[PDB]
């Protein structure tokens, strides 16, 4: 019995959507298009939503080392290691699942999410986003105690 195998990803799919900057300021139909950046977390954690699906393969199976994106008409598999998040400098990715990414980012004015496909071709999406998280408490510190 596989009565506990509820997989919502069998019904859903990664997609191509508008991105204003796919690199060098030019717009494209991006397989890593930025949908929404959430910054309600006072600890500074960013909840990022993209057009692709992380941790899912084309056959709908769950694999944390894999990523699925829309390649022209059909979805294709890509490596999780190739996925990156950056503002003014690289971000620390804390969690990935489906359309969602958790990231700890340094101060910036833009937000970029990208990956490397099967053909070794890099794909990225840049959106203007002011990131300067407020101080937790009364001391501006760097590392977590």
């Amino acid at each position: 019995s596989t009565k506990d195998n509820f997989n919502v990803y069998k019904a859903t799919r990664p997609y191509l959507a508008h991105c204003p900057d796919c690199g060098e300021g030019h717009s494209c139909h991006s397989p890593v298009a930025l949908e929404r950046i959430r910054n309600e977390a006072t600890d500074g954690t960013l909840k990022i939503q993209v057009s692709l699906q992380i941790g899912i393969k084309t056959d709908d199976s769950h694999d944390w080392t894999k990523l699925r994106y829309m390649d022209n008409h059909m979805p294709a598999d890509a490596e999780r290691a190739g996925l990156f998040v950056r503002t003014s400098a690289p971000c620390t990715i804390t969690g990935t699942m489906g359309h969602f990414i958790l990231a700890r980012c340094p101060k910036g004015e833009t937000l970029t999410v990208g990956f490397t496909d099967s053909r070794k071709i890099s794909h990225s999406c840049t959106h203007p986003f002011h990131h300067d998280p407020p101080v937790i408490g009364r001391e501006k510190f760097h590392s977590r105690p």
Binding site: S1, T2, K3, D4, N5, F6, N7, V8, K10, A11
Partner: protein
């Protein structure tokens, strides 16, 4: 008892008539049924049952 809707009928949300593998059998029909129950309190009970696949031609 939590009730869901399918055309002219009412049924228990956790028990749609398409079971097992609702989506594998009829993908369009399953999604249409789920869309019709989006406002129903037992929508997530229906989503769980419709997107679960434990086929007959299997040992476990």
């Amino acid at each position: 008892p939590v009730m869901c809707l399918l055309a002219n009928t009412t049924f228990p949300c956790s028990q749609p008539p398409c079971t097992p593998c609702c989506y594998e059998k009829e993908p369009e029909e399953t999604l249409r049924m789920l869309e019709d129950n989006v406002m129903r309190p037992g929508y997530y009970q229906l989503l769980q049952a419709s997107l679960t696949c434990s086929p007959h031609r299997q040992r476990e």
